[PDB]
Design a protein around this ligand. Sequence first.
Ligand SMILES: Nc1ncnc2c1ncn2[C@@H]1O[C@H](CO)[C@@H](O)[C@H]1O
Ligand SMILES: Nc1ncnc2c1ncn2[C@@H]1O[C@H](CO)[C@@H](O)[C@H]1O
Lengths: 330, 330
Amino acid sequence: MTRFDVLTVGNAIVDIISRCNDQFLIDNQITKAAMNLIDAERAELLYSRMGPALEASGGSAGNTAAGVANLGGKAAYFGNVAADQLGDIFTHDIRAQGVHYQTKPKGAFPPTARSMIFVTEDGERSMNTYLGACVELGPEDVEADVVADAKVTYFEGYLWDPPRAKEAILDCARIAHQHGREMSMTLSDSFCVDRYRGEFLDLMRSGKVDIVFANRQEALSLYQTDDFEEALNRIAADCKIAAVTMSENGAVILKGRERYYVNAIRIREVVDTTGAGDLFASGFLYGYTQGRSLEDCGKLGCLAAGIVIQQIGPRPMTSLSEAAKQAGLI
Amino acid sequence: MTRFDVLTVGNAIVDIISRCNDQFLIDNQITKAAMNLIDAERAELLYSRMGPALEASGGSAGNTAAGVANLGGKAAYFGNVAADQLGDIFTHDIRAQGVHYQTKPKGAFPPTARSMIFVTEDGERSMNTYLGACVELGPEDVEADVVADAKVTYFEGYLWDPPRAKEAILDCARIAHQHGREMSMTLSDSFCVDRYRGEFLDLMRSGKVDIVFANRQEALSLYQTDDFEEALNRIAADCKIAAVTMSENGAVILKGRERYYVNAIRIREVVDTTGAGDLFASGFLYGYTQGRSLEDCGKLGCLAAGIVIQQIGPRPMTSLSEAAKQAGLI
Ligand SMILES: Nc1ncnc2c1ncn2[C@@H]1O[C@H](CO)[C@@H](O)[C@H]1O
Ligand SMILES: Nc1ncnc2c1ncn2[C@@H]1O[C@H](CO)[C@@H](O)[C@H]1O
């Protein structure tokens, strides 16, 4: 028995969420469906144009850790906030879900990261993120005992944007593998993959990452191809296990020459896609650390992802364990 | 023409919202369906026990002003926040709705008011409010030109808790009535009525308040009676116009010997009752300042209230003007 099933590591962010029309994205030169990095001045400008909003704790890996805990797994999280009200919100929400979260703020400035997320009528989400205190996450924030005692340590490709987070991740990889654990990453966003393609492939090929999460766009971006079959063949050669999501078309899990396709749940209405990939990773990694088949891990991922897109906000407000039991995935 | 249809005045609050079981309220000695005032220490304690939450700008009168603006009316708001992140959220959300909001923060301490609102399975809401910077609202915050230029000035009974807000209200009443405008209040909460019964009746009987909003519980509390018919007869005698809501049983508008009964709208589900009364006041006052019949004012109020209870959070995220046009109230 170990202390943790899943440790996740990412940019600690509070989401500021509002609905907009498609013209808003065009007028403001916001790339639809993507993570758009912004500076403090641009954050002020976009906020001044944003309608009334709702706030909810976010951060891709934060959401994944919360989802693991929700399902009943034992989760931990590394991510840096500031000693401010937004940081206090973030700290409360993740700890209240039962995730181990002990990363200490380094003062009030830079302030806690926030992402202005604009949800269009089709339920797509377009994020505009000021990293703030996330730039301070570094090797000093690695709780070595936690990495050692976690079955899987999972991190965001998004961590390659701040300056020193990658150093923490390399430390995690060393500790995890020295203690016989596994490392996992998400490719996070197609433009993120554009930025760090070579680095990501090296993480996989050197064996620093064992399990990779991608959506279709990310997989295509990783190999700069329009051929999805090529992307699947290549990603399977580059990592031990790959979990590739395809929105309404479900998911495919690859291991060597093995492929396991999983159907997406049929949806009432797509309210807000924010968190879909994050919660797919929650379901998959919960199943994986419970010793479930790759197909069942995919099923658990699709169930969690389907639930989160039927609500506003990135962390399911309902019980995923109850949902999983009803679905016979238990 | 005037600059404003409705000026509202209230405790400026950010809501922190979570779902709980009925046992949680009992274990924590939270009075169900009520506004429970709390100190800083109790706020810390309750927060430590609360699950993951979402944040949304609140404040009863704030919500009412936002609803008037949503419907297409011209609204203003007086309420005091701190110079902190929660205050910045509050300031953003109300201004983004098109409400004039110019009250200046006085410092960072006390911090911006917040209310932990626990929603039970029946959709009832139980609020736990630390007033924070609201204790600083006073006569200095009265923008006399705004009061002079507003058709109706509406305020919360809740303002009788902080120490100096009542002085601002008395100043508002004077300026309003000297400029031929009307004053309105809501009784806010049955325990609030218990605390300030005599003062509230004095506001009405002296004519400082022209239009009074109450729910059934508040009306009964005002006259310490179990007889709803008595309460209606007495409230009609004590104020020029009374609007009394009765939840699923709609509302009754009273003027002198006149009575206008209005039905509740048909609804999908009671998700969260937070804001119901606030938005009834939005609909009513919007109608009133557009020169509509008292019955139509009631119908607009019931429409807005019915909309808000079908969503999480206190301010409608959909267009009230569009809904009013579709319902044929225009
Ligand atoms: N640069 C980023 N790094 C990590 N997570 C992010 C970033 N920008 C937005 N997010 C998060 O992505 C989540 C949706 O997957 C949101 O909850 C949001 O907080
Ligand atoms: N003491 C108070 N004064 C004014 N508004 C309040 C108080 N406590 C809670 N509220 C607000 O009541 C609203 C619902 O009517 C919520 O949005 C919440 O912010």
